[PDB]
Design a protein around this ligand. Structure first.
Ligand SMILES: *[C@](O)(C(=O)NCc1ccccc1)[C@H](C[C@@H]1CCCNC1=O)NC(=O)[C@H](CC1CCCCC1)NC(=O)c1cc2ccccc2o1
Ligand SMILES: *[C@](O)(C(=O)NCc1ccccc1)[C@H](C[C@@H]1CCCNC1=O)NC(=O)[C@H](CC1CCCCC1)NC(=O)c1cc2ccccc2o1
Lengths: 303, 303
């Protein structure tokens, strides 16, 4: 028993982190087979961030303008190209530590582990969710660009995020590993800001099931609700609408606890309306939305 | 910016996890150089857990009663011994992936990363604190025994915990890597229970400094306190007494934020007395005590 915000073991990703330098700009890159992936703004100077034309900047570079360092070993760059907002540097050596991997573009509400890295060196690992507003509430300092987010499934690393920037509210924005931003953001300095966010309802319900699995039951009630009356109150509290697909996703947790999904929705309605009255759930005094139904199942009854 | 419950990258420890089997009992072991470390209760049957005499049980075993599996490879056991509550199995092959490492016995209030593992296979990584009552609030299922806790410091892994059991409140107990339990617990089935716990005051103060570094300031006030009046209210709220050594430890964070330690104590006093009144600090509606001063410094201004 017990329930923690657990990240995936990070070793498979650690073996892929490298340092990329162009001019005076250094950031992290991801070295898979004979390719190194990094944010294209490594080719930017201080003068170019306002409105850069990356096609222009890149055509003015050659392979030798890119210094890739993997541990102590320098990797020679033998080709370079741009794909959306990521630069791909072909190197003359395939990473011997390449895991089985794929690139995935995730949906909002999905979770993933971030390996924070500086100068190609991993610093820490933590779990987070893609917010409905396409930002992530990370922990990133100067030099963290190029750090990646990922899930692991039976020894296959699915990479889903590459870090690019910090927004004025202190939340973070970035791309999939094919260089497409999550949300409306662009890699230039503009007035862009996070839109209004919402709470990930299906995840809150998953976490309430985790609490029951772990013996917190105080928030249950004898009531039920219809999906539409529930979605009425969710709209009121800035929660995402719950779909029938969400209900189907929550089926296994419902079956394991004997608590119908719409009954758990009646508990969530009561918690939204009444607060928690000085009590906690799984050691939190707030409703937690960073655990998917799959996260709960993995952690509570699996290995 | 941003502040997350961040664990150490786990790769150096992943390369050391193995599976140990004795009879019908299987758990995790830690393979460093030519030694595998695991809980001695791997030699226990279902009939022996009440009051086992481990010297007896062990003298009745030979090297061939222990099956050690590292990935797909079987490791041959060539010696065995007991050290407190850990078994040491000398194997004929030194782990090629052994990191620079040491064994440390930590003090209550110190934090560390746990690599949860099942059948020698890492499942997840998370951060936690040794509680004042010498238990940890982990996330552990059947098969997790032998999973370890650790810190990393410049490529040296300091191992400080090995998992052994779950107490009736759902919290966890275990040993250092030399097999000495944290707290009064023993490796047998008895009425043992966690004692009353307290909140780790110096850590709460560290985390309030993290909040200031990150722009949460709403809880500050113009007041100061003396150490003794503060410790009076801390005693009242089941907080650990704050020492001058704690104050000295918090010095660098004080210096970086310009907030004297005793002034931050006056803020904590006000928060204890008044609650948070529907507000949050670093995304929490409770006062967080699982971050040491060193954790804050590492995460907020370092790599
Ligand atoms: C990222 O580029 C990075 O880590 N670069 C390496 C580095 C090393 C030393 C100093 C700076 C950068 C960086 C990650 C940011 C940094 C700030 C703290 N947390 C983060 O996640 N990303 C940026 O600095 C981006 C750079 C833009 C350049 C043009 C292409 C798009 C990205 N900028 C910002 O994050 C940012 C925040 C902010 C606030 C006010 C004015 C400008 C501004 O930029
Ligand atoms: C740990 O031994 C383990 O993982 N063993 C491998 C394994 C594989 C399959 C089934 C069981 C064990 C295990 C870790 C526990 C398990 C329960 C959930 N969370 C955990 O952390 N540890 C135990 O099972 C210990 C065993 C004792 C045997 C004698 C030496 C001291 C340890 N027991 C308990 O944790 C425990 C909890 C509990 C509650 C009621 C009655 C007995 C009881 O034992």
């Amino acid at each position: 028993s017990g329930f923690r915000k657990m990240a995936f073991p990070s070793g498979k990703v650690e073996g892929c982190m490298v340092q990329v330098t162009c001019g005076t700009t250094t950031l992290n890159g991801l070295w898979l087979d004979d390719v190194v992936y990094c944010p294209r703004h490594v080719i930017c100077t201080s003068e170019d961030m306002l409105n850069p034309n990356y096609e222009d900047l890149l055509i003015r570079k050659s392979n030798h303008n890119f210094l890739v360092q993997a541990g102590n070993v320098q990797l020679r760059v033998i080709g370079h190209s741009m794909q959306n907002c990521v630069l791909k540097l072909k190197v003359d050596t395939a990473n011997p530590k390449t895991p089985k991997y794929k690139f995935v573009r995730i949906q909002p509400g999905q979770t993933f582990s971030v390996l924070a890295c500086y100068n190609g060196s991993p610093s820490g690992v933590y779990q987070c969710a893609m917010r409905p507003n396409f930002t992530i509430k990370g922990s990133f300092l100067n030099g963290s660009c190029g750090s990646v987010g990922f899930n692991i499934d039976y020894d296959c690393v699915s990479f889903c995020y590459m870090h690019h920037m910090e927004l004025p509210t202190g939340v973070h924005a970035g791309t999939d590993l094919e260089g497409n931003f999550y949300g409306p953001f662009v890699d230039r300095q503009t007035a862009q800001a996070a839109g209004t966010d919402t709470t990930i309802t299906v995840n809150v319900l998953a976490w309430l099931y985790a609490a029951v699995i772990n013996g917190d039951r105080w928030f249950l009630n004898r009531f039920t609700t219809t999906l539409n009356d529930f979605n009425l109150v969710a709209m009121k509290y800035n929660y995402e609408p719950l779909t029938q697909d969400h209900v189907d996703i929550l089926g296994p947790l419902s079956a394991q606890t004997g608590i119908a999904v719409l009954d758990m929705c009646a508990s969530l309605k009561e918690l939204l309306q009444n607060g928690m009255n000085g009590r906690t759930i799984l050691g939190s005094a707030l409703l937690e939305d960073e655990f998917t139904p799959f996260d709960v199942v993995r952690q509570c009854s699996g290995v």
